[PDB]
Write a protein that binds this DNA or RNA. Structure first.
Lengths: 207, 226, 99, 129, 83, 126, 25
RNA sequence: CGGGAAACCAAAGUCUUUGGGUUCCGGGGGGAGUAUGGUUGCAAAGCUGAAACUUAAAGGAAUUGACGGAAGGGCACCACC
C-alpha cells in the first residue's frame, strides 16, 4: 500500500540483505518473471525486494480476514521450516503440521486426522505438493513462499523469496507473524518487537 | 423399531450448520459450489418428495484359478419432478446391497436444472433454455427446445431422466453406441447438468458478492460445538 | 499396435543406411539398428600379471591393452544376455547402467 | 494460399476467447472486417477497437469482454430470400431468444432482424452468439 | 429469466469469475472465494471492513490466479497503482 | 531357525514402556516380575517373550531416541533445543558486502550507505 | 509366408491355363 | 490446450457451438486381384477388372486368468546330490 505507516524501513532492508533473501536460482519460470530485477554476470537471478513487501502485506491482509484463528493451517515437510511453522503457530493461533502430511487428511471424512480449514499456508510449492493438489477438491484458498524456479499451479498469493534453506526461511515466517500481529492491533507499528528473528532459524552448529 | 430422532449426528462443518441454523435451501449450498458428503442433508431439504427408479441390473466378472467370479452392478435414478435429478451406480456381490448403495450415490449426485421458453413468455417455463449436448464413451446426446404441449420425443432411457427432472416438452437426438445403457444414461445426465452453466444475455449484469455460510455462522461452530 | 516411438532404430531425416555383418552369426542388419559394444582389456589377466612382471627383462615395462569393437543383432544380444527385456514404463530410460 | 480474409479474423478471435485472453490482433485488415466487427459491438458482444496504419492493408487490435460463445463464417456466399431466411436461423442459432445471422444487402451489411424491417434479401456472411 | 408479467422464474442466479466473466458451476470444487481485510488510513489497523473475489477452477489449474488477484488488487486501491 | 518377534509381542512391549519407564531396568528376572503385575498376560511363554523385548528396548533407550516410544525425560530436553539456544547473545550482524547490480537495485529503492563492494570475474565460469 | 505362397500357386496355375487355352485356336 | 474406442497425438487440436482452397479414394466377411475383353512387353509379366454362389459374424484397443523348449529372485529327501 502507499501509506507511510506501511512503508518498508532501512532496518528491515538490512535484515533482508544479511539473510540472502534477494538471491534466487540459476533458472527462472515464465510465471515468476515480473518479480525479478536482473540476472548477474555469474548465472544467478536477483529477486526485487519491494515486490516481496507488497505480496507479504497482501498475504497478512488475507490472514487477518479470518474470524477464528484455528481455521488457518500451516505446513512444512522440509526440516528448515519445521521450527519456523511451530513458532508462527505459537505467536498466532493457527494449526501446524510438521513432517509427513497423510494423503486424504482434507478429503477422507472418516479419518482419525481429518480436518476442514478456511486458509492454507505452505513453505515450498515443489516439496509441499500433496496438500496443494488435495486443496483442489474442497474450495480452499492458498498462500506460498516462491523461489525463481517454483511451479505456480494452485497458489493464489505467491511471496517472492529465497526458500532454499537456513536464515532466509526462518526470517520470512518471523516477519509474517510480526505484520499479522501489528495490523490486528496486538503490537506496535513503531516500537521494536520482543521476539528475536534467530528463534525461527534451523540448526546452526551448537558449540 | 420406532422412528425417533438421533439416527444422525453431523461429521462435517456443513452438516453441523444444516441441522441447526438458517441454511434455508439447497440453492445457497449450490451458490458456493460446496461438496455434499452426508446423505441426510438431502433428506432434510427434499425428503419424501424424491421418487426412485432402477434403470438396469448388470452382471460383470473376473477370471481366477478356480472359477469365474461374478458381481452385480445397479444403475439408479432419483428426482422430484420439479427441477432436481440425480444418477448413481454401485457394484456388489449381492443385488440388494448394490441397489441400497446406488440410492445413496444417486442422492449425493443431485444438480439444479434450468428451464425456459420456445415462444412468447406466458405462464411458467416448460422446456430447455437453448440447444445443449453431452458425451460419454462414444455416445453423444443432444436436446432441443419445443412448442408447448409436444411432450418428450426420445428413446426410453433419456425420457425417464427428463421426466424426473420436471421438463414437459423436448426434441432429442443421439449418435454412436446407444445400446450401452450406462454411457447413454451418463451422456443424458451430462446434457441436463450443463443447462445452468451456459452464459446467456439475461445473465450478463454484474455479480454482487456476499459472505459464505462458514463466515456468517463462524461463532456458532466455536461457542458450544466440536 | 506400435511398440516404440523410434521404431527400434536411430534413422530420422534419411532414406537408406548401410548394413553390417554380425560378429557371432554373420546375419545382415543396418549400422544404426545394430547393438554396439567397445571392449578395452589387458593382454595379461589380473591373476597372471605378477608371474609375467617378474620374468621380464626390463626394469620398467607396462603391459599393453587390447581394443575390439563388437556388433550384434537383436537375437544374439538377447541370447548372449547383452540386453534384457523391460517393463512398459522402464523401456523409456536412455541412460546406460551404473558403474 | 490465403483464399479468404474474413475466415482468418473470426477464427483468430474464437481461439483467443477460449484461452481467456483480454485482447487479440487481426491482420490483414479489410473494409468487410471493420463492418462485421461494428455489428457485434453495437449488440454488446465485444469491446471497442483500434486500427494501425502501416502502408500495407493495416492491422486491428480488439478488446474482449467474455460474453461471446461463438462467431463463424459460411464459406460460399449463398443468396437468401425473405421466405427462406427461417430455415437458416433454424439451422444456425442456439435458441429463438438470442444470437444473430449477418447478411450483406444492397442497403448495407446488417443483422438478419433488420433485413425484415427493411424488407430486403441478400448474401450470407456469418453469425455470432 | 423473466416472463411477460415481469416476474422472475429462475431457482437461483449463479456467480461469475472476477478475472474472466464466466459462470461458476454448482460442482466446480476447484473454484474459490477470496476475502481480504481493509485497514484504516491514520493507523494501519483492521477496522472489520473487507473486499472479496471469486475465481474459476480452470484459471487456477493453469497457474493464472496469482496475477489475476494482483490485477484486481491494483484496480481497487490496495496496491495503489505503483510497484 | 527364526527368532523374529510378531506384532503381538512388539506392540505390548511399547505400551508397557510408555506407561512404566520408571519401574524398568536391565535385569530380565526383575522385568519378568514387573510385567506380571502391571498387565494381564494369558500365557507364561508369552510373558517371557514380552519381558525379553522390553529388556532389549531399555538398552536402546539408554543411547538415543526410538521413533515409536516417548517419555517426559526425553521430551523436556527436546523442549530445551526448542525455545532459545546458549549459542550467541546477538544475531549475525547486518554489516555485509554488496555486488554492483544489488547496489543499483537498492539505489532505485532509495537505500544503501552501509555496505562494502567488489566485482566478480571477467567472463562466465566454466 | 502363406499369402506370398498362395500368390506363387496362382501364378503357376495361370501360366498353365494361358498355354492350354492359346493352343486351342 | 484440446481431441480419441483406447493405445496415443502440439497435432491425429481449433467438430452436433457441425462450411479456409483443392487432388486421389473406402462402404460386413468370402469367391478374388480370379474369369472375360482391351492394352503395353523379347519373355517373365505390368495396367484396367466382373458375376453366379456362399455366410453370422470377420476385425481394432484394452482387462483379469492360464500357458512358454522367455527372463529374474526364493523353496521341497511325496525333488536332486
Amino acid at each position: 500500500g502507499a501509506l507511510d505507516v506501511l512503508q518498508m524501513k532501512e532496518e528491515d532492508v538490512l535484515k533482508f540483505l544479511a539473510a540472502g533473501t534477494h538471491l534466487g536460482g540459476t533458472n527462472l519460470d515464465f510465471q515468476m518473471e515480473q518479480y525479478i530485477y536482473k540476472r548477474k554476470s555469474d548465472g544467478i537471478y536477483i529477486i526485487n525486494l519491494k515486490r516481496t513487501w507488497e505480496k507479504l502485506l497482501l498475504a497478512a491482509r488475507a490472514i487477518v480476514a479470518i474470524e477464528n484463528p484455528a481455521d488457518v493451517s500451516v505446513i512444512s515437510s522440509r526440516n528448515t521450516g519445521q521450527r519456523a511453522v511451530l513458532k508462527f503457530a505459537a505467536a498466532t493461533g493457527a494449526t501446524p503440521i510438521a513432517g509427513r502430511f497423510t494423503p486424504g487428511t482434507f478429503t477422507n471424512q472418516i479419518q482419525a486426522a481429518f480436518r476442514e480449514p478456511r486458509l492454507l499456508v505452505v513453505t515450498d510449492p515443489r516439496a509441499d505438493h500433496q496438500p496443494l493438489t488435495e486443496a483442489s477438491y474442497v474450495n480452499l484458498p492458498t498462500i506460498a513462499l516462491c523461489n525463481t524456479d517454483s511451479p505456480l499451479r494452485y497458489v493464489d498469493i505467491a511471496i517472492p523469496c529465497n526458500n532454499k534453506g537456513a536464515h532466509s526461511v526462518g526470517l520470512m515466517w518471523w516477519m509474517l507473524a510480526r505484520e499479522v500481529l501489528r495490523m490486528r492491533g496486538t503490537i506496535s507499528r513503531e516500537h521494536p518487537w520482543e521476539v528475536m528473528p534467530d528463534l525461527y532459524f534451523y540448526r546452526d552448529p551448537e558449540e | 423399531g420406532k422412528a425417533e430422532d438421533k439416527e444422525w449426528l453431523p461429521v462435517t462443518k456443513l452438516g453441523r450448520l444444516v441441522k441447526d441454523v438458517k441454511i434455508k435451501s439447497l440453492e445457497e449450498i449450490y451458490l458456493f459450489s460446496l461438496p455434499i458428503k452426508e446423505s441426510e442433508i438431502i433428506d432434510f431439504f427434499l425428503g419424501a418428495a424424491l421418487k426412485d427408479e432402477v434403470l438396469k441390473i448388470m452382471p460383470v466378472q473376473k477370471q481366477t484359478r478356480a472359477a469365474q467370479r461374478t458381481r452385480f452392478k445397479a444403475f439408479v435414478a432419483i428426482g422430484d419432478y420439479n427441477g432436481h435429478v440425480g444418477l448413481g451406480v454401485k457394484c456388489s456381490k449381492e443385488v440388494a446391497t448394490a441397489i441400497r448403495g446406488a440410492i445413496i450415490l444417486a442422492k449425493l449426485s443431485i444438480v439444479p436444472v434450468r428451464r425456459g421458453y420456445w415462444g412468447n413468455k406466458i405462464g411458467k417455463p416448460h422446456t430447455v433454455p437453448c440447444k445443449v449436448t453431452g458425451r460419454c464413451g462414444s455416445v453423444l446426446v443432444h436436446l432441443i427446445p419445443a412448442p408447448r404441449g409436444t411432450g418428450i420425443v426420445s428413446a426410453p432411457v433419456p425420457k425417464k431422466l427428463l421426466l424426473m427432472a420436471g421438463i414437459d416438452d423436448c426434441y432429442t437426438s443421439a449418435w454412436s453406441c446407444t445400446a450401452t445403457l450406462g454411457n447413454f444414461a451418463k451422456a443424458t445426465f451430462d446434457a441436463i447438468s450443463k443447462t445452468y452453466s451456459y452464459l446467456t444475455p439475461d445473465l450478463w449484469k454484474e455479480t454482487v458478492f456476499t459472505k459464505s455460510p462458514y463466515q456468517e455462522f463462524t461463532d456458532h461452530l466455536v461457542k458450544t460445538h466440536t | 499396435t506400435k511398440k516404440r516411438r523410434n521404431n527400434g532404430r536411430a534413422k530420422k531425416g534419411r532414406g537408406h543406411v548401410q548394413p553390417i555383418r554380425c560378429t557371432n552369426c554373420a546375419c545382415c542388419v543396418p549400422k544404426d539398428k545394430a547393438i554396439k559394444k567397445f571392449v578395452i582389456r589387458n593382454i595379461v589377466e589380473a591373476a597372471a600379471v605378477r608371474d609375467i612382471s617378474e620374468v621380464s627383462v626390463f626394469d620398467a615395462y607396462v603391459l599393453p591393452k587390447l581394443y575390439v569393437k563388437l556388433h550384434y543383432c537383436v537375437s544374439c544380444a538377447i541370447h548372449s544376455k547383452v540386453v534384457r527385456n523391460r517393463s512398459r514404463e522402464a523401456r523409456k530410460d536412455r541412460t546406460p547402467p551404473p558403474r | 494460399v490465403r483464399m479468404n480474409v474474413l475466415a482468418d479474423a473470426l477464427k483468430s478471435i474464437n481461439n483467443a476467447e477460449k484461452r481467456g485472453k483480454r485482447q487479440v490482433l487481426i491482420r490483414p485488415c479489410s473494409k468487410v472486417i471493420v463492418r462485421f466487427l461494428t455489428v457485434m459491438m453495437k449488440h454488446g458482444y465485444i469491446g471497442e477497437f483500434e486500427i494501425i496504419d502501416d502502408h500495407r492493408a493495416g492491422k486491428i487490435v480488439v478488446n474482449l469482454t467474455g460474453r461471446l460463445n461463438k462467431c463463424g463464417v459460411i464459406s460460399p456466399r449463398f443468396d437468401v430470400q425473405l421466405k427462406d431466411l427461417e430455415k437458416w436461423q433454424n439451422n444456425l442459432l442456439p435458441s429463438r431468444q438470442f444470437g444473430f445471422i449477418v447478411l450483406t444487402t444492397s442497403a448495407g451489411i446488417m443483422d438478419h432482424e433488420e433485413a425484415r424491417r427493411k424488407h430486403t434479401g441478400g448474401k450470407i456472411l456469418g453469425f455470432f452468439f | 429469466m423473466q416472463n411477460d408479467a415481469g416476474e422472475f422464474v429462475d431457482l437461483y442466479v449463479p456467480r461469475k469469475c472476477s478475472a474472466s466473466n464466466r459462470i461458476i458451476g454448482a460442482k466446480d470444487h476447484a473454484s474459490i472465494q477470496m476475502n481480504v481485510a481493509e485497514v484504516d488510513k491514520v493507523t494501519g489497523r483492521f477496522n472489520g471492513q473487507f473486499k472479496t473475489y471469486a475465481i474459476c477452477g480452470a484459471i487456477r489449474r493453469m497457474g493464472e490466479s496469482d496475477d489475476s488477484i494482483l490485477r484486481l488488487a491494483k484496480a481497487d486501491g490496495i496496491v495503489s497503482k505503483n510497484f | 531357525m527364526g527368532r523374529v518377534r510378531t506384532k503381538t509381542v512388539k506392540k505390548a512391549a511399547r505400551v508397557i514402556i510408555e506407561k512404566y519407564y520408571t519401574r524398568l531396568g536391565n535385569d530380565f528376572h526383575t522385568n519378568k516380575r514387573v510385567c506380571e503385575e502391571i498387565a494381564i498376560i494369558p500365557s507364561k511363554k508369552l510373558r517371557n517373550k514380552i519381558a525379553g523385548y522390553v529388556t532389549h528396548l531399555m538398552k536402546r533407550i539408554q543411547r538415543g531416541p526410538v521413533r515409536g516410544i516417548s517419555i517426559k525425560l526425553q521430551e523436556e530436553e527436546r523442549e530445551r533445543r526448542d525455545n532459545y539456544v546458549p549459542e550467541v547473545s546477538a544475531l549475525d550482524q547486518e554489516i555485509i558486502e554488496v555486488d554492483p547490480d544489488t547496489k543499483e537495485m537498492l539505489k532505485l529503492l532509495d537505500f544503501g550507505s552501509l555496505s562494502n563492494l567488489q566485482v566478480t570475474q571477467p567472463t562466465v565460469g566454466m | 509366408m502363406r499369402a506370398k505362397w498362395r500368390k506363387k500357386r496362382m501364378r503357376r496355375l495361370k501360366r498353365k491355363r494361358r498355354k492350354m487355352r492359346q493352343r486351342s485356336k
